[PDB]
Amino acid sequence: REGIEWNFIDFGLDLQPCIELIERPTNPPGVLALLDEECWFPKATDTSFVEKLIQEQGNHAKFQKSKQLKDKTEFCILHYAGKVTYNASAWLTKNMDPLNDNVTSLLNQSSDKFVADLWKDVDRIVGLDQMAKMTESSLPSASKTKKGMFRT
Amino acid sequence: VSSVLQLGNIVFKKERNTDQASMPDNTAAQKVCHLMGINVTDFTRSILTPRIKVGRDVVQKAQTKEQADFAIEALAKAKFERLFRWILTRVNKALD
């Protein structure tokens, strides 16, 4: 920009394909994006999310599949500080963060002032009525948020 | 903090004749309800047999043992996360 006498030195340090692998939302999607959408399908499980993750990512040059664990369901990614094995069991539940709304509304109107202040915002509690049952996890939808503005 | 711990002592036991679970003690729920300032029977009905609404309908159902454990587990971590966020805003209130 200032136009000094210089010649560019590559230092070889950019981590962006590792970041796109997790972050990317559209075009070839990332680990977070697939976890966001599989989350809203009634025949998805944490296992389907990993088999979909091989479909989008698979060959990618910062991705690697597990030591043949597709039962536990796990994958590996090559981060700047090393290769982590990630185990994807109960990640749709964590990305969703569901709660029983019937007990939650009891706290909203409680006879402790402190509990009532702590549970003052119930407007974004998300009901699903999801049947945690191994092999066949089943995801109904019982949504309940103001104006339909919920976020993964 | 004590009620977040105390929710972990609530024990769902799978009942063979309906395939649901029921609450086979009153003390664990009684301690939790007193320290949440809420009612034992309305809590017990809400945890086992919630009266939810799906869009248009009213679905009054019974939850299984695995689901009742998950519901109490989720409520405990959520109330802990709410306390940390409250404490953080309470700290920011005086600093700035």
Q: Give residues 60 to 89 of A whose Cβ lies within 8 Å of B.
A: none
Interhelix angle B40-48/A101-108, nearest 10 degrees: 160
Q: Which residue from A98, A101, A106 is facing B38, i.e. has the nearest CB?
A: A106
On whether the CB atoms of residues A143 and A150 are closer than 8 A, the answer is: yes
CA B59: distance to chain centroid?
A: 19
Cα gap B69→B79, rounded to integer Å:
16
Cβ–Cβ contact A119 with B under 8 A: yes
Name the β-bridge partners of A82.
A79
Resolution limit, Å: 20.0
Cα gap B32→B42, rounded to integer Å:
13
Q: Within 13 Å and on the Cβ side, how many CA atoms surround A111?
A: 7
Q: How far is B42 from chain A (nearest CA, A)?
A: 8
Name the β-bridge partners of A85.
A76
Q: Is A86 helix (H, G, I), strand (E, B) or coil?
A: strand
Q: Do B36 and A107 touch (CB under 8 A)?
A: yes
Q: Which residue from B37, B52, B82 is facing A101, i.e. has the nearest CB?
A: B52
Looking at beta carbons, which residues of chain A come within 8 Å of B34? none
Q: Do A111 and B37 touch (CB under 8 A)?
A: yes
Cβ–Cβ contact B70 with A under 8 A: yes
Q: Which of A81, A30, A23 is nearest to A60 (CA)?
A: A30
Name the β-bridge partners of A78.
A83
Q: Is A129 helix (H, G, I), strand (E, B) or coil?
A: coil
Looking at beta carbons, which residues of chain A come within 8 Å of B39? 106
Could you tell me which chain A residue has the CA closest to the CA of B76?
Answer: A99
Q: CB neighbours (10 Å) of residue A37?
A: 14
Cα gap B62→B47, rounded to integer Å:
9
Eight-state DSSP code of residue B56: T
Q: CB neighbours (10 Å) of residue B69?
A: 17
